[PDB]
Write a protein that binds this ligand. Sequence first.
Ligand code: NCD
Ligand code: NCD
Ligand code: ZN
Ligand code: ZN
Ligand code: ZN
Ligand code: ZN
Ligand code: ZN
Ligand code: ZN
Lengths: 362, 362
Amino acid sequence: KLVRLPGLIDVHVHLREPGGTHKEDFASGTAAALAGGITMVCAMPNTRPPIIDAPALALAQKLAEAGARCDFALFLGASSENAGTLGTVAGSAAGLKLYLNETFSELRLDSVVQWMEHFETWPSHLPIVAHAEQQTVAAVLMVAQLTQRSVHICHVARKEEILLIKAAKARGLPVTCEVAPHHLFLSHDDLERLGPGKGEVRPELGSRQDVEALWENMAVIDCFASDHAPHTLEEKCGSRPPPGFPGLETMLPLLLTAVSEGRLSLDDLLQRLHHNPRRIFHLPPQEDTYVEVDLEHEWTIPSHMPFSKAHWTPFEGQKVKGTVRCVVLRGEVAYIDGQVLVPPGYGQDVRKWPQGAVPQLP
Amino acid sequence: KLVRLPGLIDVHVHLREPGGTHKEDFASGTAAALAGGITMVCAMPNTRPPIIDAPALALAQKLAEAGARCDFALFLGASSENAGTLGTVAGSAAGLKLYLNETFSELRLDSVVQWMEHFETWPSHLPIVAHAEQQTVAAVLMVAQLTQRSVHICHVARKEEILLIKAAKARGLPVTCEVAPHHLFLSHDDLERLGPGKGEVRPELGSRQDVEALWENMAVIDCFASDHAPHTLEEKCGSRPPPGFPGLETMLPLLLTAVSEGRLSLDDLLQRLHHNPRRIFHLPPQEDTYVEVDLEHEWTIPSHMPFSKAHWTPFEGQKVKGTVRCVVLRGEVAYIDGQVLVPPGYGQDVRKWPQGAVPQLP
Ligand SMILES: NC(=O)N[C@@H](CC(=O)O)C(=O)O
Ligand SMILES: NC(=O)N[C@@H](CC(=O)O)C(=O)O
Ligand SMILES: [Zn+2]
Ligand SMILES: [Zn+2]
Ligand SMILES: [Zn+2]
Ligand SMILES: [Zn+2]
Ligand SMILES: [Zn+2]
Ligand SMILES: [Zn+2]
């Protein structure tokens, strides 16, 4: 007896194309998405070249249109030089991503004044998302208030951060957030098994108390998003390991396991992987699109999932219950039981669909 | 320059068929919906016969399929006798409506124990909505906690009620709510103009402080819904006036006026008339469906709107800015500039669409 779900949306993935295609490309990353029950992805801009101007956006759009197997939108990234220059292409992007801490990125902003400039110049009706850890959450929330607009906080990982956001929501402030599976299902207790290379990720893995605080405050979490951040094992275990975990193929099985245990409901899951991604990012429906899952099947996560080029996973050895059996995307079978059946290029940029433009005042 | 909006959803309308068709029927009520930029409606069960058993549901479904011009779902109503009897038809309804106070309804529940019985027997994955005023909000919230499930509060009208819901949300409780336009745009100050017959409505009109509290707490309001409750003028001004206002044709023009004044944003409006109705009630997208509005057009609400058989309005004389120019429903022009162009019966029961069933565990 299979359960039919709507097409799930991951608003935070790194697909590494252009410029890092040994780690992942559009074709392999979207195969991993479909195998994880995800039919739409929002791809982050910290590629090489990074997506921080109109020519880079145009290049990435064509590469995505040619390689993606599921539908997508592409973020623009904020830089120290591009505030006020993105107005003509802003509406074609998923939103604007701000990198406000140290991580796998050179998109460094040196000054809060640069954050203010982006919040003042980016069109007020379009999404802004931030990599903002610990006190940086409070600081970017301040900039959002000074400029009278909303902000979405990426991968919330700490009790400190979820309680701050909770207090902001109680004051009626327009803030939303997402949480990634590794911050719900891994902790400091896993660092000995993972080791210091594989274990590198930003935000870093939390304490057991951090993990328990996220679960206790599920009502504060608007979205789940993988922060799929593939790097090869060689890279993860070498002299200067980059931060990040792959996670498209494991996120839904982990969360379905939690549903089966009563830790959250099926509805709680669908709000956070479908309805709230849709409404925060104004993403369009996908016609004739659905995901069929088997909630009874027990398996153990292996040393690598089939599709991501990362060819490793930090969830190796975890027992899960739940698996993706079939994905239909816009009327075509896209995935069955380990086989992807739509080619590179089947996927489309949802911001070009008439129903995918963000409504605005004339 | 027109603005294109998605198909808007009104989760609280009274279409009076079967049994009250001099006040409204499916054809006239859904014409009023389309003229108000609404493409999907959830119809309440306090008809004659009321929709409280499978035979009444089957009758209403056929009448709606034959008369509706826009798409719809039909609520079931809770009674003192039907707890535990609705399991086979529950998934075909919009949800279950509980009438917990005195209003235009005989669906009286005598005891909180009856509320508990409904919360225990209605399928836990399906919506429950309540007419619950003042302390009744707190009481039904208690029953929802005792039975470990969610509840949606209809037409919140008072500072007391919105602050209670605000405090519940801060504690992480699964409660959502809607507000009707007359509780945002009318108050006690209008009772002298309206008089005691026309002014009758449940919840009654609030004080200026009630209205200001709803606006101040917009972040707490999940949905706008009209509580379109048509009665004829003769009925409203006779010896025992029934409570209720018509409102499908005026709700969006009133709210667009507020947007133009900066009282809320276009996004705030779309969350509350599209995204959150979708996600609370698991309502499906409508393909090739959109509403085109003109935000510049200034007009004054007349003594009656063109389509509702109520043939009166409590908003007569209010100056508004914003009007519905065109509605396209599933690829057909449904409304242009005062003309409805889809016939009775064009509309469909969204719960019969594959994507309109509420997902559940096997
Ligand atoms: N999360 C990570 O550890 N790395 C991300 C960057 C990011 O999201 O910070 C990546 O792109 O590798
Ligand atoms: N709101 C009203 O005053 N009347 C409603 C019933 C209701 O929603 O209470 C009606 O159906 O007439
Ligand atoms: Zn393509
Ligand atoms: Zn990040
Ligand atoms: Zn990231
Ligand atoms: Zn029909
Ligand atoms: Zn009511
Ligand atoms: Zn009502």
